[PDB]
Structure 1
Amino acid sequence: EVQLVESGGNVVQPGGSLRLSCTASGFSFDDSTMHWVRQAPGKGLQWVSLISWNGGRTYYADSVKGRFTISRDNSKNSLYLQMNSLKTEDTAFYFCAKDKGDSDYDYNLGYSYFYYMDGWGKGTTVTVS
């Protein structure tokens, strides 16, 4: 049993910035990778960003690679995803979801990391302009 909580969403304007705080507990972040997706009304899921324990494997989706950055720390076990240069078609409920972080190792091929969300947070809110 794990819980994820997010806060900091409010009215936003295009070209502005917003600070989003997403704390969680019940699972250590030392060996956990956090995801980010958004759920616009009437539409399917969309991938936003990915992050590893320290760095690398922080790949971003094609349409949201402009100036979006995600950072993590171990001191207080929380995550951030600051919104920047908000467009007029990127308004939706952003969701942060835990990942199991399973892997595999073959001497010839090397480390292979699999990705699939396990736990999900309550959800945030966005409103352009």
Structure 2
Amino acid sequence: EVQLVESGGNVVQPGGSLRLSCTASGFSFDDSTMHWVRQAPGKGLQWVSLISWNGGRTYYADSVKGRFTISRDNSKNSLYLQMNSLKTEDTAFYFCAKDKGDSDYDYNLGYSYFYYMDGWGKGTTVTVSSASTKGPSVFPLAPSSGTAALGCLVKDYFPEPVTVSWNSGALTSGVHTFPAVLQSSGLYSLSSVVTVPSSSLGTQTYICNVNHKPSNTKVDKKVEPKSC
């Protein structure tokens, strides 16, 4: 049963370099052609590069031509990808995939290969950003007096991800934490809301707990109705 494990994804500045690796098992790596396919977050699949069993045939996509380098080491069941001179456009999910390896011979027309994917890995994440680690600022989204909505603006952080809970985990009913937007500053921002019994607003007490492990920051903020 085919198994592929990408690794070495990280965060790097434009111009920088990074080396993804992938580890196979459950099939004959030695006989197999491999691929790198990447996927911009939210967007579609984009083929990056392929490489035959011995390195015989290797091709690259126009996008990465001259900057990326594919390689392998059959003694280790390992596929490698060397990304140099990175751009932000290279920020994505990097998948390694095995090819069924279907071919075809004809003594005067040469060989003919029919590439397509047979197994995929889980992925590994590559982020290319001018920004560097920074914990979030946390602002109250105060409810403005049926039910009411209140929340947290989690502003200007990097890299991803942030996680938000309410009342140290004891409030889950009515809670939604959105996806982050990435602003011009290269910094991320997200919000979290919870809808609550409009009446129980001067009594019951609401606190959101933000956690950002990349910067080892943790914030607690109590959200109280405004004053006018």
Are the counterparts in 1 of residues 55 and 71 from structure 2 also a CA contact under 8 Å? no
Structure 1 residues 11-70: Cα deviation after superposition (integer angstroms, max 9, x where no partner): 211111112221110111221000111111232211111111122320111111022111
* 1:1-129 mapped onto 2 (5 Å cutoff): 1-125=1-125
Higher-helix-fraction structure:
2
Give the superposed CA RMSD.
3.9
Normalised TM-score (structure 1): 0.90
Q: Tell me, what secondary structure is at the counterpart of 2:24? A: strand
Q: Give identity over the alignment, percent.
A: 99
Larger RCO of the pair (alpha carbons < 8 Å, separation 6+): 1
Distance in 2 of aligned mates of 1:25 and 1:73: 13
Structure 1 residues 82-110: Cα deviation after superposition (integer angstroms, max 9, x where no partner): 22111022111011111010111112212
Are the counterparts in 1 of residues 34 and 96 from structure 2 also a CA contact under 8 Å? yes
Distance in 2 of aligned mates of 1:46 and 1:19: 19
Distance in 1 of aligned mates of 2:61 and 2:10: 24
Normalised TM-score (structure 2): 0.52
Distance in 2 of aligned mates of 1:11 and 1:43: 19
Structure 2 residues without counterparts, runs of 5 or longer:
126-227
Distance in 1 of aligned mates of 2:61 and 2:18: 20
Structure 1 residues without counterparts, runs of 5 or longer:
none
Q: State the 1:119 CA deviation.
A: 0.1
Q: Tell me, what secondary structure is at the counterpart of 1:63? A: helix
Q: State the 1:74 CA deviation.
A: 1.7
Q: Tell me, what secondary structure is at the counterpart of 2:63? A: helix
Distance in 2 of aligned mates of 1:65 and 1:51: 14
